[PDB]
Amino acid sequence: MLKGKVAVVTGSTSGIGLGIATALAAQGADIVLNGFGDAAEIEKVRAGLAAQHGVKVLYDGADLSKGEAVRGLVDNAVRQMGRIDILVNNAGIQHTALIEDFPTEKWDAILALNLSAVFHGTAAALPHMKKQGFGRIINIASAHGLVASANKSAYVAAKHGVVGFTKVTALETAGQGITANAICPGWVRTPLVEKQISVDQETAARELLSEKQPSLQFVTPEQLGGTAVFLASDAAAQITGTTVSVDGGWTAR
Amino acid sequence: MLKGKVAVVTGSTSGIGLGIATALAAQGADIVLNGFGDAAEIEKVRAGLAAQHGVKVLYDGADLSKGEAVRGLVDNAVRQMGRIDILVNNAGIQHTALIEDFPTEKWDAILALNLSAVFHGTAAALPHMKKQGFGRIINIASAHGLVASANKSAYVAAKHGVVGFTKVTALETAGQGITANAICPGWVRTPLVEKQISAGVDQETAARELLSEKQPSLQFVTPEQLGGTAVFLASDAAAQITGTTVSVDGGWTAR
Amino acid sequence: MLKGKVAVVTGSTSGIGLGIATALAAQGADIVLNGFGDAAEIEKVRAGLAAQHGVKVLYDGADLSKGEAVRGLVDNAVRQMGRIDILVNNAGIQHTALIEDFPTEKWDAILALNLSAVFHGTAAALPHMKKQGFGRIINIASAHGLVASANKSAYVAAKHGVVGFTKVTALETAGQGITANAICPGWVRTPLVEKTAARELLSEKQPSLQFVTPEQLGGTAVFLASDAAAQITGTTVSVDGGWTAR
Amino acid sequence: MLKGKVAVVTGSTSGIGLGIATALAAQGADIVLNGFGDAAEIEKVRAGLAAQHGVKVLYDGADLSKGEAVRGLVDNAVRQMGRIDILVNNAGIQHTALIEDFPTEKWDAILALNLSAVFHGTAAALPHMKKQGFGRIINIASAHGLVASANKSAYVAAKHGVVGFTKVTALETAGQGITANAICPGWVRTPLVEKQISALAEKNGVDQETAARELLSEKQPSLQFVTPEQLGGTAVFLASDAAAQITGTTVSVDGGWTAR
Numbered sequence A: 001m002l003k004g005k006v007a008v009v010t011g012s013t014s015g016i017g018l019g020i021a022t023a024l025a026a027q028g029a030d031i032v033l034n035g036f037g038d039a040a041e042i043e044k045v046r047a048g049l050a051a052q053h054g055v056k057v058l059y060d061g062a063d064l065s066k067g068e069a070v071r072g073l074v075d076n077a078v079r080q081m082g083r084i085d086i087l088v089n090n091a092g093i094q095h096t097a098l099i100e101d102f103p104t105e106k107w108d109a110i111l112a113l114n115l116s117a118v119f120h121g122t123a124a125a126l127p128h129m130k131k132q133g134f135g136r137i138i139n140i141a142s143a144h145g146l147v148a149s150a151n152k153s154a155y156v157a158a159k160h161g162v163v164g165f166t167k168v169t170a171l172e173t174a175g176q177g178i179t180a181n182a183i184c185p186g187w188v189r190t191p192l193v194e195k196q197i198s199v200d201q202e203t204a205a206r207e208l209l210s211e212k213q214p215s216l217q218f219v220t221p222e223q224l225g226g227t228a229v230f231l232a233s234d235a236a237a238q239i240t241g242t243t244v245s246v247d248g249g250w251t252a253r
Numbered sequence B: 001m002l003k004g005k006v007a008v009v010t011g012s013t014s015g016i017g018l019g020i021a022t023a024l025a026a027q028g029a030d031i032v033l034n035g036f037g038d039a040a041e042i043e044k045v046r047a048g049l050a051a052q053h054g055v056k057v058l059y060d061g062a063d064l065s066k067g068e069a070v071r072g073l074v075d076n077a078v079r080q081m082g083r084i085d086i087l088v089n090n091a092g093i094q095h096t097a098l099i100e101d102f103p104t105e106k107w108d109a110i111l112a113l114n115l116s117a118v119f120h121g122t123a124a125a126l127p128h129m130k131k132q133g134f135g136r137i138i139n140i141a142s143a144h145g146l147v148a149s150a151n152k153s154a155y156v157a158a159k160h161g162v163v164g165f166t167k168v169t170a171l172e173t174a175g176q177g178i179t180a181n182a183i184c185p186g187w188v189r190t191p192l193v194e195k196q197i198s199a200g201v202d203q204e205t206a207a208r209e210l211l212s213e214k215q216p217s218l219q220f221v222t223p224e225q226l227g228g229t230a231v232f233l234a235s236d237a238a239a240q241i242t243g244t245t246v247s248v249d250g251g252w253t254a255r
Numbered sequence C: 001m002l003k004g005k006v007a008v009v010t011g012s013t014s015g016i017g018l019g020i021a022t023a024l025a026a027q028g029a030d031i032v033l034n035g036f037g038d039a040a041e042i043e044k045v046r047a048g049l050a051a052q053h054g055v056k057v058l059y060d061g062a063d064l065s066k067g068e069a070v071r072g073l074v075d076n077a078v079r080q081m082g083r084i085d086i087l088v089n090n091a092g093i094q095h096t097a098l099i100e101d102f103p104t105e106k107w108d109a110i111l112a113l114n115l116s117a118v119f120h121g122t123a124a125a126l127p128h129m130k131k132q133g134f135g136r137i138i139n140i141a142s143a144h145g146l147v148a149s150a151n152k153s154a155y156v157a158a159k160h161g162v163v164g165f166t167k168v169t170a171l172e173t174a175g176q177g178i179t180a181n182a183i184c185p186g187w188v189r190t191p192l193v194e195k196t197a198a199r200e201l202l203s204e205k206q207p208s209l210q211f212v213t214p215e216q217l218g219g220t221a222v223f224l225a226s227d228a229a230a231q232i233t234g235t236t237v238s239v240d241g242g243w244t245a246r
Numbered sequence D: 001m002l003k004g005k006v007a008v009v010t011g012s013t014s015g016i017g018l019g020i021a022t023a024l025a026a027q028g029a030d031i032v033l034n035g036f037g038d039a040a041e042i043e044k045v046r047a048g049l050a051a052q053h054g055v056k057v058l059y060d061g062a063d064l065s066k067g068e069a070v071r072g073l074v075d076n077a078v079r080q081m082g083r084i085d086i087l088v089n090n091a092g093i094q095h096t097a098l099i100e101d102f103p104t105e106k107w108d109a110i111l112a113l114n115l116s117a118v119f120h121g122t123a124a125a126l127p128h129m130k131k132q133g134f135g136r137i138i139n140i141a142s143a144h145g146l147v148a149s150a151n152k153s154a155y156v157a158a159k160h161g162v163v164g165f166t167k168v169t170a171l172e173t174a175g176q177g178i179t180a181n182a183i184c185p186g187w188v189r190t191p192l193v194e195k196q197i198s199a200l201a202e203k204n205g206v207d208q209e210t211a212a213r214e215l216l217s218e219k220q221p222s223l224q225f226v227t228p229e230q231l232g233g234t235a236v237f238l239a240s241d242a243a244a245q246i247t248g249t250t251v252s253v254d255g256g257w258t259a260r
Ligand SMILES: NC(=O)c1ccc[n+]([C@@H]2O[C@H](COP(=O)([O-])OP(=O)(O)OC[C@H]3O[C@@H](n4cnc5c(N)ncnc54)[C@H](O)[C@@H]3O)[C@@H](O)[C@H]2O)c1
Pocket: A010, A011, A012, A013, A014, A015, A016, A017, A034, A035, A036, A037, A061, A062, A063, A064, A065, A090, A091, A092, A093, A113, A140, A141, A142, A143, A184, A185, A186, A187, A188, A189, A190, A193
């Protein structure tokens, strides 16, 4: 369990990030949620987690394009919650086009959120974790941090960058009670994906998965949350600077 | 938890394998132990796990250097325990020598136990797992299944072979309720390593010096950590983790 | 032999990019040098290479830290040479500091040069290559595109990003007569590195205890540009004396 | 070029090993051929290469499933040729089946030849190379030494073992003028692959060229086969001085297979 610990999860107002925050809450950690969305819907989620799990849950809507807003998210977590034990760098965006057709605005944006936000968040958290003599940094990368797909140049470059950044973090913290690892999911069934799915649908789901994901099954936010729980546990104290692939066999082949 | 499930752990009479068996028993799994040592101590271990955790624990002394014995261990497990949910292929041996000096008998011994026994155990377990709609194969490889050290050609070859074999097992079973993964530990503080650490400064100073070459954390991995890693791969959160390696190595493979 | 082909080598005024341009010049490709330094001491080079190997050798001083300058270099290299056959993305900078001590400006500068310049060059080069039906993108990454060292976060991240970017470039051009690959060097005795103790510096990372040389890297680029390397695409070639083997 | 140098290429009577042996002979290297097939055709090959390239070419038909025979091939190459500069460990066999259906005899045969022959060959070569202060060991692994495919358990395990073995070899010889690397090809349209094209051809009840494009499509984004000449060219590169600090690594020649 993680009673007495505080976890910040970026981009946790929905999807994977919310699944992770929810799993960490269920182990007793206080939580900082982050992301965009409807004010009322977010408050429902925040109040609901706090009441269901008996922990404190803050919401900080910091826009993570801006490195100063990222470092301020972390510093505010420490101000409001007392400490920061676990940082999950999860927020991300996508844009598909050929390299030649790839808008520079999208390239820049993808790197800023998907990579540089990891740097800024991690830079802000480390001094606290080192003083504590305890930390877990869990970066949510992708199968695309290890291998590539056509038409995803910026996202693949950024995720790969996250993997290498994760390894450096780990080497700079080795033996100080801090680990840093990257979870690399394959396909997770988010509403964005759900659109693409629409001769019936569970024949369409299987067909969409079959190119990359041999199990023909989606990964779930709940499974990624249990993977983050595991990495946050004492059993994972010597797991550092590595990747945990949660991808249905995508990287096996 | 793993109540009602059955785990066979090869090489579990001591060390990493016993750590894994223990962690699995503590989640409620029935256990088949295996390996060598003193038979009185083995029975003490077996009885004590069963009493402490309220699970059924068997011992099967199969010599895993023999393919038909590995297969019989798995078949005996199913016969006696009723099913097989988790197979941990852990038993392993080592020899250090330059390649040109490496005895053929040692090459062949290391391949037979560290690699071929994973093939034989997997082959026997898979039909049962596919019929159950559930299985977890957990192969204990090493950092030396991903990277090399000088003078360890047979161990490195076999552990690499285990990593690749793990991937194929995952691809043959993908979607069938079965996963196969390889845990890749760095240094764990066994009696053997202790003897090296024994070999002018303080004990814990020599420990850090010895870890220094390969393990950035300068902290040993423990059998309990590796047991909790096996518990996690056996859990439902790990249902889509298949055909991959989980490195428990203090930063060894990050650099 | 590469006669009738044009190579752009970014960062070719010194160290490995020059090493590579020279090696490629020695095979009959026309060269576009690029980089910083004395306008005249570079003329010595642009002149001495063109005379030594009997090829056209341009110079473009484009600051690659700007995305539009990269795409200009490429488009101008086409205009001044007629075509582009080989793009070598080599220009790169370093900075060593703990992550929490790492200046954001240095972070952004490493990412703009070491990574985004590679995206920019490739975006500019690709339409010409796809029409040519022939291309060689060779990105000069590092051992640090595959593994990490402490205190080098922006560089390791950029270099991992290049490796990943190379793979996508390969996948988008597959079967179109274009390949993209990354050479991942270990230690090279540059000016910066040069400043015995030479075996002990290599000792931590590079088991051969021998430096990699620009001519070696030049040979490696020449190979990837060859017909034998036609189905070598989307991959890394480590020239690192054993660094990544352990 | 390799004038004055001796290369041993296992499994060089056909397919990839033949392309590699030819490219090395074309650089001035003396060649020991090895492998099976039709003996008249093998002699035509051996005499042909010797004459065409003006180098010495021998055939040793050692069965490399036996470790003594592998060491014997290397020993006698040094006896008969004067030295050994290049060892290309290339011979291999394939068998497909589900793991639970995979005959123990086929598992053993694929480990013996595809992995243990690399150990025996390297072990016999190294003392000579270390003495000479020069050597190139080039192991022909596969994309399957880095990633898997279903139904190829023994072959994927053996190829992965070759990749790890190659790394240890590099580390043991680092700095001594010896490098050890593994070329990792994707599909090459040899008879090893033809049997597979034919099996896919019959499964889907389709022609042979449907099967080829589809075989390629599953794995190899270029949709073009790799050729023995390309692999020969890659081996010549690794044997060169340009590759002096390329050691303990893999070179994928796979049309994008491992990029995705
Ligand atoms: N969904 C998949 O199939 C998949 C697969 C592999 C990896 N991932 C990765 O997992 C992570 C989570 O994404 P997801 O799939 O749940 O998407 P999602 O849209 O469901 O959630 C993304 C979250 O990030 C937040 N966000 C976006 N921009 C932000 C900004 N500038 N500042 C603060 N928050 C911001 C959103 O508000 C939201 O809470 C991403 O890094 C993604 O790339 C997703």
